[PDB]
Design a protein around this nucleic acid. Structure first.
Ligand SMILES: Nc1ncnc2c1ncn2[C@@H]1O[C@H](CSCC[C@H](N)C(=O)O)[C@@H](O)[C@H]1O
Length: 453
RNA sequence: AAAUCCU
């Protein structure tokens, strides 16, 4: 047969993609059906027929999965912020464990290495310490909410499910004040309006709140009066920042940062020590599981008093300063000035005078450290989704480091980079996934690579 | 490809 647009066909889902979309096969075409779990009988409406693949919609459910979550509140967030909410939490952990095993095989050619089960939350809800929230006009009303997948169409929402309840109350309180003061929301198509987004970071243990008003222009009309109101409702707001982003882009922040009130940072704890976090600086969104993520990497590293650690992709120096008292030297690198400046202050704040940072790209610092004659025994790395470059992997091999711990939020690039480490004499010993992002497709992973000879 | 969604 020859399928085409708006044809209803009975199919069976036999797999999930890494992003969470159901996979079905009909006449040599791999169809990707949204909101469809494995072993489900459905009438699939064909959306777009392609050369080798296809795309579909569930027109009717004939048989649903035993592992389906019927929660109506999570179903609203499926095409968006909680794209594995419709799968039950035990199976999310099995799914993410499978993704690490499948990716290490398909990319790296590895089938005989320990990938233990994913360490999940006891209560997998209300976890995010940061929350980026766009502001838009919906039916002539200023609304805070979330975009649907593959769009900038704002779905208004108050209860975010996966975010801190206090952050939800702050963004709802900010929404009301933007309505009250009559500040115009940013229209993306028209290129009109002031208030683009709202970023609200809140410490997991401390509870100290930052607010960032992302805007098109520098001038915000009656902002000091608007700031004065949120302090009465939420005294824990130690800082209110302003970011200016005049360009038309999917990216949130522009260049110019300003301090409208109080500090230019919040303070929050991880493990024993305290850490100052700036607005543009990175902070692990799930502090509870990030502590378990670090403690896995720290135990995997098998640290000694005479070890020399490299914490590449430092951020605010959470991993490095957590182990600096238990080792001889700690060397870190971080591209963003605001993050590495926190990192230096965090070392001083916790009486750590052996944490030596540099502001550069990771590959550049490794070339310098290799040239100037540093002798690192352990290499801890925690890059973004894109992962490591070939320069860094080759340079880090030439240092003659005993162990390398790879923390990642994208197994695809991790499996690619591990494949190159195997070519330069580093065997992959252990792997341990940790669920930093419940109710979503994203998988955090730690991986001990140990050297031969 | 840049951060939970944010083509
Ligand atoms: N080429 C590069 N070299 C070094 N750092 C980079 C980089 N590209 C991005 N980064 C930075 O690396 C950081 C990754 S997140 C840092 C994780 C941190 N150690 C923690 O666990 O808290 C970000 O702050 C990002 O700005």
């Amino acid at each position: 047969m020859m399928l085409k647009k708006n044809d209803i066909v009975e199919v069976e889902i036999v797999d999930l993609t890494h992003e969470g979309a159901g996979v079905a096969k009909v006449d040599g075409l791999v169809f990707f059906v949204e909101n469809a779990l494995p072993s489900e009988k459905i009438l699939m409406r064909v959306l777009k027929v392609n050369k080798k693949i296809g795309f579909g919609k569930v027109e009717k459910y004939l048989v649903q999965s035993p592992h389906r979550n019927q929660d109506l509140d999570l179903a609203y967030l499926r095409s968006g912020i909680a794209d594995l909410g419709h799968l039950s939490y035990p199976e999310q952990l099995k799914f993410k464990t499978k993704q690490v095993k499948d990716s290490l095989y398909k990319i790296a050619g590895i089938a005989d290495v320990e990938v233990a089960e994913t360490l999940g939350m006891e209560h997998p809800v209300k976890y995010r310490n940061k929350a980026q929230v766009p502001v838009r006009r919906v039916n002539g009303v200023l609304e805070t909410g979330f975009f649907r997948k593959n769009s900038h169409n704002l779905m208004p929402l108050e209860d975010f499910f996966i975010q801190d309840p206090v952050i939800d109350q702050v963004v709802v309180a900010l929404r009301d004040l933007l309505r009250r003061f009559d500040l115009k929301p940013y229209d993306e198509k028209e290129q009109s309006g002031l208030i683009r987004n709202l970023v609200v970071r809140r410490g997991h243990y401390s509870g100290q709140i930052m607010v960032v008003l992302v805007t098109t222009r520098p001038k915000v009309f009656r902002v000091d009066q608007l700031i004065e109101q949120v302090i009465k409702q939420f005294p824990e707001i130690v800082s209110v920042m302003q970011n200016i982003n005049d360009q038309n882009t999917n990216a949130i922040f522009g260049k110019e940062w300003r301090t409208l009130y109080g500090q230019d940072y919040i303070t929050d704890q991880m493990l024993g020590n305290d850490f100052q976090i700036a607005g543009p600086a990175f902070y692990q969104v799930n502090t509870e599981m990030a502590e378990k993520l670090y403690q896995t990497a720290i135990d995997f590293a098998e640290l000694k008093k005479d070890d020399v650690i490299i914490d590449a992709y430092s951020g605010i120096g959470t991993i490095g300063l957590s182990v600096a008292k238990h080792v001889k030297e700690v060397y870190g690198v971080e591209l963003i000035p605001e993050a590495v400046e926190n990192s230096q202050k965090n070392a001083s704040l916790n009486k750590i005078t052996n944490a030596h940072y540099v502001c550069d790209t990771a590959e550049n610092a490794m070339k310098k450290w290799l040239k100037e004659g540093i002798q690192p025994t352990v290499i801890l790395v925690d890059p973004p989704r894109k992962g490591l470059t070939e320069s860094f992997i080759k340079a880090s091999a030439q240092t003659g480091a005993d162990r390398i711990a790879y923390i990642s939020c994208n197994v695809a690039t991790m499996a690619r980079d591990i494949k190159l480490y195997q070519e330069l004499g580093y065997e992959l010993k252990k792997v341990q996934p940790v669920d930093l992002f419940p109710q979503t497709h994203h998988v955090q992973t730690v991986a001990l690579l140990s050297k031969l000879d």
